[PDB]
């Protein structure tokens, strides 16, 4: 539905705060900041020699946190492209995430170690707690306002901490239905409201409302707002995301390189988008204020927009025949 030839080795992308720019990582380890309106590249940053697998914009949009595969995280000013700060860790980093309401702070999910929240002003770090002490794979994310931290382990356990004190404000373990746990693949939140989603190893996305987890307390049984899956193919989900408003949810079937689109309230599947059967789906993102969806597959990015009835359909356009309502004086002088 529209691709870009000007970028190669697309690996990970991230919309800015207003959905005007897109920073995509490349295998060479370069940042390609490409613009939507001019439909061209806005910037090229020599980030790492190692490909970049995690990228996040700052709220003001002037900072981008990038993670190399060399366990090298670095902050870059979008105007200049300089490495503002640079750090390295053990247990290679799985993800970075700016704090949405404090760009000085940034959480980092490493591979084998617990996620740690650092600051840029001071090169300090706060290691977030781990429930089972043996997960070795815990994804973590700020909420919409950056007030709480949601951490999900490979054993389905879900901890909600407060971002400042790291104190356990809520907890619950998700189930595979019967009695078993499932590897929490990812935690996503809505940029609007409080609904969030969890991708798990059961290939079943679970949509909740964080207020219900907060009122559920520690070690409770919160039910999901929704349960979403491909009941037909039972396909895993490499990457999923909400819509900009938060009423549409998309999942990327890397198994068959497709895109499933459900709703939030009803949860019925909006639609499906099919990509090149030969392409391996890698990354998925939604335009924050547009029905536009960016996909990264086999190093190539594709764009999926959604237009209205007009752009040619605007006499007064009607859809179905209209019986004329004759009047009393319809034949009168």
């Amino acid at each position: 539905d529209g691709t870009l030839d000007c970028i190669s080795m697309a690996l990970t992308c991230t919309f800015n705060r207003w959905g005007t720019l897109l920073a995509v990582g490349c295998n060479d380890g370069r940042i390609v900041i490409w613009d939507f309106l001019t439909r061209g590249i806005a910037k090229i940053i020599s980030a790492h020699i190692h490909p970049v697998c995690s990228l996040c914009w700052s709220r003001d949009g002037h900072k981008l946190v990038s993670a190399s595969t060399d366990n090298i995280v670095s902050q870059w000013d979008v105007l200049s492209g300089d490495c503002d700060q640079r750090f390295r860790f053990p247990s290679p980093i799985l993800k970075v995430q700016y704090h949405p309401r404090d760009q000085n702070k940034v959480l980092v999910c490493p591979m084998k170690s617990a996620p740690v929240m650092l600051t840029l002003s001071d090169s300090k770090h706060v290691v977030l707690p781990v429930d089972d002490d043996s997960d070795l794979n815990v994804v973590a994310s700020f909420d919409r306002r950056g007030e709480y931290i949601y951490t999900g382990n490979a054993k389905g356990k879900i901890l909600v901490l407060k971002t400042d004190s790291q104190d356990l404000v809520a907890s619950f373990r998700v189930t595979t239905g019967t009695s078993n746990t499932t590897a929490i693949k990812s935690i996503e939140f809505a940029r609007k409201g409080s609904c969030f989603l969890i991708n798990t190893a059961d290939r079943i996305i679970r949509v909740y409302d964080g207020r219900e987890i907060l009122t559920c307390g520690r070690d409770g049984e919160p039910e999901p707002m929704q349960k979403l899956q491909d009941l037909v193919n039972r396909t895993p989900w490499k990457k999923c995301c909400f819509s900009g408003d938060g009423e549409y949810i998309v999942a990327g079937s890397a198994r068959q390189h497709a895109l499933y689109i459900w709703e939030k309230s009803i949860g019925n599947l909006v639609k499906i988008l099919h990509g090149t059967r030969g392409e391996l789906l890698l990354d998925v993102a939604w335009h924050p204020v547009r029905p536009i969806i960016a996909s990264i597959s086999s190093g190539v990015v594709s764009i999926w927009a959604q237009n209205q009835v007009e752009n040619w359909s605007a006499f007064k356009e009607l859809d179905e025949n209209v019986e004329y309502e004759e009047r009393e004086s319809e034949f009168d002088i």
Partner: protein
């Protein structure tokens, strides 16, 4: 009511002037004409800054950049040309319009260009590569004026076929089509400063301010004379809220914005006052007349 008095008279274009525009900083005045020449002048003293040539045919429109650093020139050579105002260098020459290009405008973020041509199709252009990104069979007649909204989400277009069409920028979607019960040839169109209204001139001695959210004409302005040429209209805001325009009677008409009543008539031009420009900061109005005058006059009022 304004008391605009003539302060500086500017001239030098060997042919009919087609557009004069104040720089957004109010530092310069760019004047385009059919003589394939553009003229930058001092905006406060009438000091002729320089002449920028390079276009192959007559110039029908020119538009400033928001940072007062670039100028797009739409010429009758079917080409646009983006110039650095400081060096006068032809940074870009935009090819692709199949006929005479009549109007041109930058996006509010100055990184994009809209262009109307005689080909009756509106082209949407990159700035940093100068590449045409979109092209729309907008009207059934040569386009007269195109302009951006306050942010660059909407593009308004006018043409001789009398249609005023609002189009989506991201998609080219023809959002709205404003009709006034007839087919009056619309020679100019532009958004309101608040992006809430639209000023459109029709070639029947009539100006019309429409509500965008309502899609209906809110105010009308007459008393001037405009029936053949692309006479520009501007919002006087640095002092009182007025509507300033040229007229085919050698006058510079100034109506009250709200009451729609003529608040001043600047006389001194000998030909049709073909182009108008309002200073962004000061109560200064540049009025350029046609070839029987070939003069640009600065007017300064106290309110």
């Amino acid at each position: 009511k304004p008391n605009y008095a003539l302060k500086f008279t500017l001239a030098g274009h060997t042919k009919a002037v087609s557009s004069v525009k104040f720089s957004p900083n109010g530092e310069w005045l760019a004047s385009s004409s059919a003589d394939k020449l553009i003229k930058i002048w001092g905006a406060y003293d009438g000091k002729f800054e320089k002449t920028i040539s390079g276009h192959k045919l007559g110039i029908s429109d020119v538009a400033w950049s928001s940072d007062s650093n670039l100028l797009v020139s739409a010429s009758d050579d079917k080409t646009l040309k983006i110039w650095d105002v400081s060096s006068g260098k032809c940074l870009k020459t935009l090819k692709g319009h199949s006929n005479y290009v009549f109007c041109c405008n930058f996006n509010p973020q100055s990184n994009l260009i809209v262009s109307g041509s005689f080909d009756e199709s509106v082209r949407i252009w990159d700035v940093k590569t100068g590449k045409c990104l979109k092209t729309l069979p907008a009207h059934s007649d040569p386009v007269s004026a195109v302009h951006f909204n306050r942010d660059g989400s909407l593009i308004v277009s006018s043409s001789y076929d009398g249609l005023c069409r609002i189009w989506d920028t991201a998609s080219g979607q023809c959002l709205k089509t404003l009709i006034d019960d007839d087919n009056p040839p619309v020679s100019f169109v532009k958004f309101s400063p608040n992006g809430k209204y639209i000023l459109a001139a029709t070639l029947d001695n009539t100006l019309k301010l429409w509500d965008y959210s309502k899609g209906k004409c809110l105010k009308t302005y007459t008393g001037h004379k405009n029936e053949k040429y692309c006479i520009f209209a501007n919002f006087s805001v640095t002092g009182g809220k007025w509507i300033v325009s040229g007229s085919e009677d050698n006058l510079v008409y100034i109506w009250n914005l709200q009451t729609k009543e003529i608040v001043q008539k600047l006389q001194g031009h000998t030909d049709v006052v073909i182009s108008t420009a309002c200073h962004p900061t000061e109560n200064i109005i540049a009025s350029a007349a046609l070839e029987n005058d070939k003069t640009i006059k600065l007017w300064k009022s106290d309110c």
